[PDB]
Amino acid sequence: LVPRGSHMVGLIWAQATSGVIGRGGDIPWRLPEDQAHFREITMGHTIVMGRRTWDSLPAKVRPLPGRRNVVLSRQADFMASGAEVVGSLEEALTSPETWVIGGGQVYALALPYATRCEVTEVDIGLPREAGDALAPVLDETWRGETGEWRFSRSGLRYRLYSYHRS
Ligand SMILES: NC(=O)c1ccc[n+]([C@@H]2O[C@H](COP(=O)([O-])OP(=O)(O)OC[C@H]3O[C@@H](n4cnc5c(N)ncnc54)[C@H](OP(=O)(O)O)[C@@H]3O)[C@@H](O)[C@H]2O)c1
Numbered sequence: 162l163v164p165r166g167s168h169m170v171g172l173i174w175a176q177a178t179s180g181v182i183g184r185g186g187d188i189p190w191r192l193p194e195d196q197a198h199f200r201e202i203t204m205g206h207t208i209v210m211g212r213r214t215w216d217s218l219p220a221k222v223r224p225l226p227g228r229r230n231v232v233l234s235r236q237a238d239f240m241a242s243g244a245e246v247v248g249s250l251e252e253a254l255t256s257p258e259t260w261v262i263g264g265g266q267v268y269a270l271a272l273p274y275a276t277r278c279e280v281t282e283v284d285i286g287l288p289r290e291a292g293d294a295l296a297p298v299l300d301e302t303w304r305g306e307t308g309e310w311r312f313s314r315s316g317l318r319y320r321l322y323s324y325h326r327s
């Protein structure tokens with residue numbers, strides 16, 4: 162689907178229905194169903210994340226296994242064992258296909274370059290609070306399909322969106 166001379170940038174995230182994606186250095190829900198989805202989309206690929214998202218990764222999956230982990234930071238001395246640290250968005254997006262995997266800051270920055278968004282919406286009414294990381298806002302140029310609600314094993318509802326643009 163992607164010619165090898167191109168540079169497809171895609172964003173992938175999970176959000177509460179309020180747009181909250183992050184809080185207290187973590188994701189404020191647990192959803193193995195979403196974890197599986199995230200892996201299906203990103204496995205084998207270059208993935209790009211902000212330094213705080215690197216910090217947020219559970220120790221057991223830092224770096225995220227089976228993927229080329231790229232961490233954006235302005236700290237030259239940052240230690241991200243098993244990953245590479247780059248100081249600019251430009252050096253981060255050199256692969257023919259890249260998945261930007263968080264967090265709020267990096268989604269916001271990368272969106273203008275992006276032509277795919279893979280979104281999980283969790284049916285949880287978490288009000289927005291000072292300091293929360295939020296999902297980026299998609300304008301009218303985006304289009305795609307909204308999947309049906311499904312219950313997770315725990316009875317938490319979720320659904321998937323698959324957006325793209327030209
Ligand atoms: N629900 C989801 O899908 C999802 C996914 C991922 C993360 N999260 C959550 O989101 C939160 C983190 O998001 P966040 O917005 O706070 O932080 P972030 O985007 O992960 O990372 C921010 C950092 O990235 C670096 N950075 C940003 N722009 C840069 C640029 N142009 N060049 C170089 N470096 C740059 C800076 O690091 P330095 O400060 O080191 O310079 C900055 O502090 C956490 O709560 C996490 O759990 C949620």
Ligand SMILES: CCc1nc(N)nc(N)c1OCCCOc1ccccc1CCC(=O)O
Pocket residue numbers: 173174175188195196198199200218219222225226261262263279280281
């Ligand atoms: C699974 C959370 C998640 N879900 C979606 N749809 N997009 C993300 N960018 C995302 O965040 C990716 C970074 C945080 O990753 C995790 C956070 C908690 C548990 C497991 C994982 C990823 C597990 C893995 O991919 O090996």
